[PDB]
Structures are given as C-alpha cells and as structure tokens.
C-alpha cells in the first residue's frame, strides 16, 4: 504494498486570534497532569497554558456497561481516565475482538486534538467510572490565543530596545519566533562578571539586581540587561542576580546574527 | 536582474489581486470526461471545451461540505491567489464560476500525471533527477514568498509533470497571503513542520521545511518521518532526528540537515541571505538557475503522451455524478467567489 496509497491532506478548523472552568480536586489535578506530560501536544506547554488546559477539561461520568466512545465516532475528543475499569474492542472485516483493557488509568484520542479522527476502538465501562474530556476546538483556542498573546506583542518588549529600535516589523517577528524563556529562584546568578557575552535578557516578571566590584542597576518588567553582548563580544562587565522568583526572555546573540546580521548594521540605518 | 524581476512581478500581482476576476464561464460549456484525482477536500475532473475542443482539469468543490468542514476562507484564498499569480511552474487558472451546489475552478490540464505515481513506480530518483525538480520548487517558493504567499501542501501528489518534463504545482487549497503569522493546522501529516504541529504561529519557514521532506523523499523513495501511528510521526518530526540512506551523497545530507532544522535560527530560507543559502548551496552548484527558469534544460524524464485527452498517466477512480440541486446552497458564504 500500500506504498501506492496517497497521503491525504489534513486540516483543523479556522481560528483567527485577532472561559469556563471545570472544578476538580487537588489530587485529581496532579494525576491528570501526570497522565498528560508525555503526550506530545502537552509535553512542551508553558505552565500557564497547561493550567488553562486542565481548567478546560470536563467531567464525564459513566455507568457500568456504557460506551464511552464508539468505533468510527467521537472524532473530536481526548479523554483521560480518573476512575474505573474499561474494555477496549475493535471490529474488523469481520470480527469483533476485545483487544485489551484499562485499570483506573489511561488516555486516548490525542490525535483528535489536531484534526477530526474517527475513533479506532469502542471503549466500554466495565464498572462505574469517571473520565476527563477535552474538545479539540476548546484546546486549540486556549493554545493559539495564548501564543498570540505572548507574540505580538512581546514583540512590544523587543521594540522598546534602543539597540533594536530600527528593526523592521518582519525582522522583529523573526526574533519573536525564537526568543527563549528562563526562570530563576531568589538569588540565582543569571549573569557572572567575566563570562562569555553570549546573550541578552528581558525581565518578564520579578526583579534583577545588576552589580559590580556593588549596586549599579535594578531591573524590572520591560527592562533589558546583558545587551552589550549585541555590540561587543568582550566579557561581561557586570553580574545579574535574581531578586526572588524571576522570569526572563533570553536571546543568544549568535542566533540573532544568523537571522539578522550584526546588530550594529541595524543601528547604522536611515 | 533577479531583484528587479520580482519587483515587476509584485507589481503585476498587486494589480490583479485587488481588482479580481469572476464568472468567466459555465458548466454547460464543457463535457465531463474522467475523474483525475479526488481527495480530502474536493475532486478534479477532466473536461473538454464544447466549442473549441480544448481540454482542461476542472476542480470541483461542494459548497455544503466546505461549510461543514469550516473551510470557506481557504476556498476564497485559492481562487483569489490563482487569479493573480503567474509563474512558469504554477498551473494556470483559466475559468472560475459557481452554481447552486458547487464552486468550479478550470485549470490547465497537465497530462504527465502526478510525480507521486512516477516516483512510487520507479522507487527513487537519482540525485541529479531530484535536483532538477527541487530547483523548480526553490524558484517557485521564491516567487510566492516575495508576494507574501505561502503554499502549505508540498508533496509528490501535488506536483504534476508536463510534456516538457517540467513541474506544475496544482492544489492551492491551503495557500494564504500572510504578512505576519498565521495559525491554521493544515498540510499533509508527513510534511508538517514542527511549529505547525505545536501551534506556535508561523509564516514562510514551513514551506522550506516541506522542501527538505520532499527532497529527501525524492532521492530516498520514502519520506524521513514515518510510523504506524500519526502521533508517532509527529513525535519524530518534533524530535527532528533524521537517518539518511547510505547512498545519500554527503553534499545532499548537508542540505537536508539545514532544511530539516527544527531550530528557526538555523533553517535555510529563514536567515539573512534567505533563499540564497539554498541556491548557493553546493548540492545546487551544478544548477543554472536562469536556465531552469527559462525551461532550457533537458528534463531527466518525459512522460508518454498519446493524444490530447489521454489519461494514461492517471489512476482510475469511482466516477461520481456532478449533481446540481434546483435549490441554491450557501449563497451568502460564497458571494465573493
């Protein structure tokens, strides 16, 4: 062979990004988080996206004997087991088989979170049980509307930089695409005096103490530091430390120059 | 001369873009002949022009299905974009119209069949063979992108071979004009770039990714990311770990690690020198980029053409009727078409 079978195009629903909570216990929330962390579409989500995604997941109760999903239906939902036992069943040519079972944990349907996907199996409660569900369009809006919010404009953080004020819009979006995030605990050393001038930083939340010898600069939400890495490769003059819990954006200058060329050539412009 | 060529090209485009074309024919003007391909979103039909005898490939979309699948905008994108673009390697649109039940787009008929058929029948293409095609894609993407158009469904099934053995790109259903970033998860599972899979937002870098997948699959005969389950394919794509066949030349492998780069600060196409990183790359050292544009190179392969309406080079499909209801459906939704 079926080396000659074409590969069909795929397509999720349109959503242009230009609020209900389903209550659940503390332990349900941890276990539900647990069962999701290795699944591709959840693996890399920032903590707040995740939290929004758990918030959205709804309670589905089942009675012993109930079909949770039916083979060839239910193409838009993903499910995690909170509670109960379940049989898994596949019908073929042919023949209807029990191909396995679930014992109070398990998930299924994650592909439906990408585009419509007719379920490959029927799944039946063999006890009374409960699951958590998640609609695709709900999932998509959370994620997309959240990345749109991080990206235009935290493009807004970037454009406020004196060294970068002369970027074009599209050049700025290239930096938005790849700019990394870093989190530091109280008194962590973000930058050490003497080190490689590898990258510059923007404070997203919290506060950073710039020191030398003692105090030079205080950094807080919207301010940059380490930015001389953009114009000279000579070693770090100062040292940055996190005051309390700190979140920074962080940009490798060498990645910056692959995308855009030397920062000074941008500063030269008229 | 390239920098100015695009300037004239952007000029011509913007003129047709803003002041578009409409209702340029009607169904009773053609004879249906055979179904040439069907798919997830629409079917294409060989047709003969009743008055001039001319043959055409006519795309037929069903207004009700488009509305259910939440893809109205994609249909309007395709027709608008097709009416305004112009390039040696894009299949030209000749007529468009709608009726009570369907939208119709009548393209040039490219009789040589899908690259998919040919590549699967042969197994793989020699690197020069593959290089010849890859070049046309590199040039076609340069053109589209300078108009801020992304294509979004590169794959052997969407590339047709003409009688001169050159390529025509055909299915524009996913093409969009994007100035900033766009967000629709769409394409073909094997050809999806990481940032589409993870909904990061994206623009032109995904076409170049796709080209890496395409080039790889032409020279190896199978795409670089494969598995039993789609999710596992996506897990591989997001990983970005690629194994190369032992017969890949070292020059080829180098181009492909640069194209199949998950990291946007390193993907060829997305850096300072943009597309020149690819065009100047050594695997393409033997390519005469103007000669390819001018169609002055011998194709490594010419299809067998037996006669004006011949369908030898296409698979056979269950023939459905083109049904037109006496009631007009979804009029408001498609007024712009």
UniProtKB/Swiss-Prot annotation, chain A:
The modification Phosphoserine is found at residue 9. Phosphorylated by the activated catalytic chain. 3',5'-cyclic AMP 1 binds at residues 41-162. Signal peptide: none annotated. GO terms for biological process: fatty acid metabolic process; learning; modulation of chemical synaptic transmission; negative regulation of cAMP/PKA signal transduction; response to antipsychotic drug. Keywords: cAMP, cAMP-binding, Cell membrane, Cytoplasm, Membrane, Nucleotide-binding, Phosphoprotein, Repeat. 3',5'-cyclic AMP 2 binds at residues 163-270. GO terms for cellular component: cAMP-dependent protein kinase complex; centrosome; ciliary base; cytoplasm; dendritic shaft; dendritic spine; glutamatergic synapse; neuronal cell body. It is found in: Cytoplasm; Cell membrane. The inactive form of the enzyme is composed of two regulatory chains and two catalytic chains. Activation by cAMP produces two active catalytic monomers and a regulatory dimer that binds four cAMP molecules. Interacts with PRKACA and PRKACB. Interacts with the phosphorylated form of PJA2. Forms a complex composed of PRKAR2B, GSK3B and GSKIP through GSKIP interaction; facilitates PKA-induced phosphorylation and regulates GSK3B activity. Belongs to the cAMP-dependent kinase regulatory chain family. This is cAMP-dependent protein kinase type II-beta regulatory subunit. It comes from Mus musculus. The gene is Prkar2b. The chain holds residues 104 to 393 of 416 of the full protein.
Curated annotation (Swiss-Prot), chain B:
SUPFAM superfamilies: Protein kinase-like (PK-like). Its main location: cytoplasm. PROSITE patterns: AGC_KINASE_CTER, PROTEIN_KINASE_ATP, PROTEIN_KINASE_DOM, PROTEIN_KINASE_ST. Keywords: ATP-binding, cAMP, Cell membrane, Cell projection, Cilium, Cytoplasm, Cytoplasmic vesicle, Flagellum, Kinase, Lipoprotein, Membrane, Mitochondrion, Myristate, Nucleotide-binding, Nucleus, Phosphoprotein, Serine/threonine-protein kinase, Transferase. Changing residue 192 to R: Reduced interaction with SMO. Disruption phenotype: Frequent early postnatal lethality. Survivals are runted accompanied with mature sperm exhibiting defective forward motility. The modification Phosphotyrosine is found at residue 317. The active site is at residue 153. The modification Phosphothreonine is found at residues 35, 182, 184. InterPro entries: AGC-kinase_C, Kinase-like_dom_sf, Prot_kinase_dom, Protein_kinase_ATP_BS, Ser/Thr_kinase_AS, STKc_PKA. Its EC number is 2.7.11.11. Phosphorylates a large number of substrates in the cytoplasm and the nucleus. Phosphorylates CDC25B, ABL1, NFKB1, CLDN3, PSMC5/RPT6, PJA2, RYR2, RORA, SOX9 and VASP. Regulates the abundance of compartmentalized pools of its regulatory subunits through phosphorylation of PJA2 which binds and ubiquitinates these subunits, leading to their subsequent proteolysis. RORA is activated by phosphorylation. Required for glucose-mediated adipogenic differentiation increase and osteogenic differentiation inhibition from osteoblasts. Involved in chondrogenesis by mediating phosphorylation of SOX9. Belongs to the protein kinase superfamily. AGC Ser/Thr protein kinase family. cAMP subfamily. This is cAMP-dependent protein kinase catalytic subunit alpha. It comes from Mus musculus (Mouse). The lineage of its organism: Eukaryota, Metazoa, Chordata, Craniata, Vertebrata. The gene is Prkaca.
